[model samples]
Target: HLKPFPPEFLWGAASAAYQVEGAWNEDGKGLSVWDVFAKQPGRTFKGTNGDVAVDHYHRYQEDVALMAEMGLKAYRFSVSWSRVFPDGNGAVNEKGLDFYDRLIEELRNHGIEPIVTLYHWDVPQALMDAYGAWESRRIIDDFDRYAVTLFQRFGDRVKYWVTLNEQNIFISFGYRLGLHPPGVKDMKRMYEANHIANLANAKVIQSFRHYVPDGKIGPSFAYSPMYPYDSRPENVLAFENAEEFQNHWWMDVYAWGMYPQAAWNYLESQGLEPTVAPGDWELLQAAKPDFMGVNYYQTTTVEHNPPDGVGEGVMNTTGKKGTSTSSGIPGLFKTVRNPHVDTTNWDWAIDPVGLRIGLRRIANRYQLPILITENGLGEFDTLEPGDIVNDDYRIDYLRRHVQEIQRAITDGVDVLGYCAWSFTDLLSWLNGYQKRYGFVYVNRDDESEKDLRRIKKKSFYWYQRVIETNGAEL
Candidate 1:
């Protein structure tokens, strides 16, 4: 037998402000980078946008009620920065503030802990227009201002605070790949902007000390364990490179406030080192996160790449089985298919053991409690007759992952909680609505905004039992 989950295991689910909240331009809410990015003629999947997304902005009461029905212990969600301060600075939007006030109160009413994330990659369009968003250092102060505002308003009731959600995802996608908002593809500028984002993240965490002294705060990292393609020595070195460049680059700063020497040297060799101002390191070191919020999905297997190999490749945006291509740095490492593991339709390896390995690694390195901020399978769900979605595969995915979390806890990892990726079917960003990651099936599509009805999936009831037993039933 394995050790039981801790007495206070948070059996919950998560959603981002932009992915779930859809009142894009309502009630004095200002524009965000996503709002502008998805408006262009050829932008967004199937011409779909978050204009009306699951309508969570207006229907949060129902969502929270559903969570209460399922006995959810916590609910992790992000607050849209522009919602509170429409212009990204100056006058505050009372209406936007009032929305979260009502939301927090509702979660409290149902005894569900509200895990609030301060930023979830929805930079205010105003900030981009003024100082290129994260490109300049000005965003650091504005982000702190926004974080403090929320801490003052909700810190009394909200104890779990995630400073930033998936910084690596947004920074690389937005600046390096041009696949996300602001759509810049310059390496030097990407490193500069990413450096500023790290400072902003540190600044917010430091501010947390003054505001929510008793609250737990950390940045949610999009962490995936990197593996060697085989037992070859070069492949092992490639794994090191991928791990340092992709994961530790962000996690090390969040935990220790120092760049890894190997990764820094490599970036310097490429002439892509970020500009560091006086006191940047002190600020980074002063604000160490209380815990590591990990948004783990899949493990990547990498092999050594030659001097002239593949760099960027096509992403499987259509949800097809074999469309996504492998991409990697020319001389560092390249991702390859893991023949030993099963893959989802989008070619993402389904490795539950990776979760355990990732948790153990994080716990061993940082020596901090781990909060699983987001983990779920994004797949195509078919609504069967009688308004039921037979998502048995989703049930399998979640149960196995939850089992690994239990294994990690047994291995002496201080796991604070595990929150599933989402609560209701919402926007999938680039993948559109077809790629779903929710227990509650919301009736909407990329083509039309059908009757927005909430239908609980088979996994919903399954997870409900898991929560009731505190992970004993699964």
Candidate 2:
């Protein structure tokens, strides 16, 4: 027997505007970096883009009605910056604001709290062309203006706000890995751009205090807590370095407004540190968040890597099982398979215990309420006749993860709520439409739109019961 979930716990699901809302260029919406990047030759899988991603932009009312029927208490969605400011600055697009206004009102009418995200990897391409997006400090003021506009408009109805979603993922992929937008493969530039992003995140939160003083806001982190492969001193030290370099680099700034000293020293020794200007530290400390938004998926296991070992590996964006290889830093640590846990078709580790560990770690370090902004399985689902999808595997994945959250609650962590990765089947950024992750399956494919029909999967009814019972049943 475990402690019951809080009476006010927000059980919900999440989606990003770029991933779900199609009509990419509709109604005065500006182009985003992703919109441009995804169209480049050999960028996305099979050249599948989010041009008409489930048509959520047109069918949002139907989507919200589905949430109401599922008894969803909250819905975490992002506003496209390009949608608000066609050029990422200067003019306010009333049509973009109107779209969200209608969506928020729809959610509220059904008693669903709206958790809004300001940016979710969709930077206005105009901004990128103007000043290289996050690479320049100029983005600090521009991002502040964009965020303040959102706070002024939707602050009243939206109590929970996420400043940036998966800052780590976007910064790394966009710069270091050359896998995402503004594809650049420079180590020093990655650190510089990332530092500017830190400032942008802090600046927005600080502005939130002035505009939406009563709202709770934070940056959503894609955290995958690391573990030592063995108890040897070398492996333990490797884990420590990895933790400080990867985890503390961003989190410490968000929670405490300071960089981890050891990691900073290491980077400085390597001549790869970002130039921190005057008053930067003050701004970072000033914008402490009301909570830590966690987008947890899996934990990583690391072992000591020699001075000349592998530095990076290719990611499995095609959803082929066992295709993902190990990757890590030379002379520090390297990622290896954790044999103890199972894996998905995409090779992501299935570690519910990792979620518990991560929650406890955040509780110990930040001492802020934790909101699980995204967590769900991305798998292939086949729809049979009579509009049926039996996705028992997804049900199992979510049920176990929810149970771990219950355990974390019992341990006295100030948990806020949990929003599964997505509510409906939408376009996966790199893996295309094959890697589906949603309760409601959409009738679409990598090549064509199969009517774009919405059919509830077996997990849909299962999750409905979980929400109805308030985490009492699985």
Candidate 2 TM-score, true structure as reference: 0.99
Model 1, stretches more than 4 Å misplaced?
none
Per-residue C-alpha lDDT of model 2 across residues 218-272, encoded as one tens digit per residue? 9999999999999999999989989888998989989999999988887899999
TM-score of each: 0.99, 0.99
C-alpha lDDT of residue 32 in model 1? 94
lDDT of 2: 0.92
